[PDB]
């Protein structure tokens, strides 16, 4: 029912990451969508059981690496690696502490704006401060 | 590796244009909003943007239930035409008013009876996040 109703609306899976006291903290999040283009704001959902999200929510800047569409197996595989201490991935840490996965098409350097509870997860709305595109990576469709 | 805008990277991203409507003291109030997207599935919550200059939105934002009718993808000409009609006193449209006051446009494929959950400032507009309490598919 719910899936069928909103099937026409695709969404992304992303890696959320930051350097905290020189230690990489990262998680995968789903239902990633833009909610405002100008000014740029985006939204994703994080599980309330996440042990990593508490370490990230209050950081000055978070790195959003867009992995792909939610139902893409390759994107889900990257998401799994993100949860696995970034196994086999190259990471880039900006001076702000925001961390990105090299080899992903879209990097959004972001800051949390609002938290909205939603069942077993939390909706996270963020301001986007910088957008970087990798030309060597096929764009998300 | 080159800089970009969210506008550029997410231009071809499908988002909706919707009619938001309610019966207020027996008078129809409605407006069209875009950048409509689901921000959560289970439970369902949705988001759209409304201009801060809107004279209709303040009449709607505090109503117990709003009717969201999804008109189509926001770049589709037929959807834009429905949005225009919505703003032109629902010209040529059939409306359905629930006892709750939520109003829907007949002939649209998805009705979401909704309540405002959060308002997030966004420059010259506002991001409206709503909790969806009833879903109807035509």
Cβ(B19)–Cβ(B30) under 8 Å?
yes
Cβ(B133)–Cβ(B116) under 8 Å?
no
- Per-residue DSSP letters for B17-67? EEEEEEEETTEEEEEEEEEEEEEETTTTEEEEEEETT-SSHHHHTTSS-EE
Separation CA A141–CA A53 (nearest Å):
27
Measuring CA to CA, how many Å separate B68 from each of A51, A114, A116, B95, B101? 36, 23, 20, 12, 12
Beta-bridge mates of residue A29:
A14
Separation CA A60–CA A49 (nearest Å):
22
Structure determination method: X-ray
Task: Collect all residues with Cβ–Cβ distance below 8 Å to B95 and sequence separation of at least 6.
Answer: B21, B28, B103, B104, B105, B106
DSSP annotation of A115 reads E
Cβ(A72)–Cβ(A32) under 8 Å?
no
Task: Collect all residues with Cβ–Cβ distance below 8 Å to B39 and sequence separation of at least 6.
Answer: A31, A33, A35, A43, A45, A116, A123, A125, B45, B46, B47, B129
How many A/B residue pairs have CB atoms within 8 Å?
Answer: 121
Question: Shortest CB distance from B2 goes to which of A2, A113, A133?
Answer: A133
Q: Which of A57, A133, A62, A67 is nearest to A94 (CA)?
A: A62
Separation CA B34–CA B26 (nearest Å):
26
Q: Which of A79, A70, A74 is nearest to A32 (CA)?
A: A70
A9·B7 Cβ contact <8 A:
no
The H or E element containing residue B83 is helix B77-87
Separation CA A25–CA A79 (nearest Å):
14
Beta-bridge mates of residue B20:
B31, B68
What's the residue count for chain A? 141
Tokens of B72: 């189509």
Interface of B with A in 29-58 (CB under 8 A): 35, 37-45, 47, 49
A1·B135 Cβ contact <8 A:
yes
Tokens of B1: 């590796």
Give the position of tokens 């919550």: B45
DSSP annotation of B118 reads E
CATH architecture of B1-138: Roll (2.30)
Cβ(A26)–Cβ(A17) under 8 Å?
yes
CA dihedral A58, B36, B10, A29 (to 10 degrees): 40
Q: How far is A102 from chain B (nearest CA, A)?
A: 10
Question: Shortest CB distance from A131 goes to which of B4, B120, B122?
Answer: B4
Interface of A with B in 90-129 (CB under 8 A): 106, 108, 113-114, 116, 118-119, 121, 123, 125, 128
- Per-residue DSSP letters for A61-97? -EEEEEEEETT-HHHHHHHHHHHTTTTT--EEE-TTS
Q: How far is A63 from chain B (nearest CA, A)?
A: 14
CATH number of A1-141: 2.30.110.10
For chain B, give the longest Cα–Cα distance. 56
CA-based angle A3:A6:A11, to the nearest 5?
A: 95
């Amino acid at each position: 029912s719910l899936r069928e109703a909103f099937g026409h609306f695709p969404s992304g899976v992303v890696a959320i990451a930051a350097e905290v006291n020189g230690t990489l903290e990262g998680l995968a999040a789903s239902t990633f969508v833009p909610v405002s283009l100008d000014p740029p704001l985006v939204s994703f959902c994080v599980q309330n059981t996440s042990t990593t999200w508490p370490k990230l929510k209050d950081r000055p800047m978070l790195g959003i690496s867009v992995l792909g569409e939610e139902h893409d197996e390759a994107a889900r595989t990257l998401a799994a690696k993100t949860g696995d201490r970034f196994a086999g991935l190259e990471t880039v840490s900006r001076p702000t502490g925001a961390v990105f996965i090299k080899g992903t098409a879209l990097w959004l350097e972001s800051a949390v704006e609002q938290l909205i509870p939603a069942g077993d997860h939390t909706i996270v709305v963020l301001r986007v401060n910088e957008v970087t595109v990798d030309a060597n990576v096929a764009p998300i469709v």
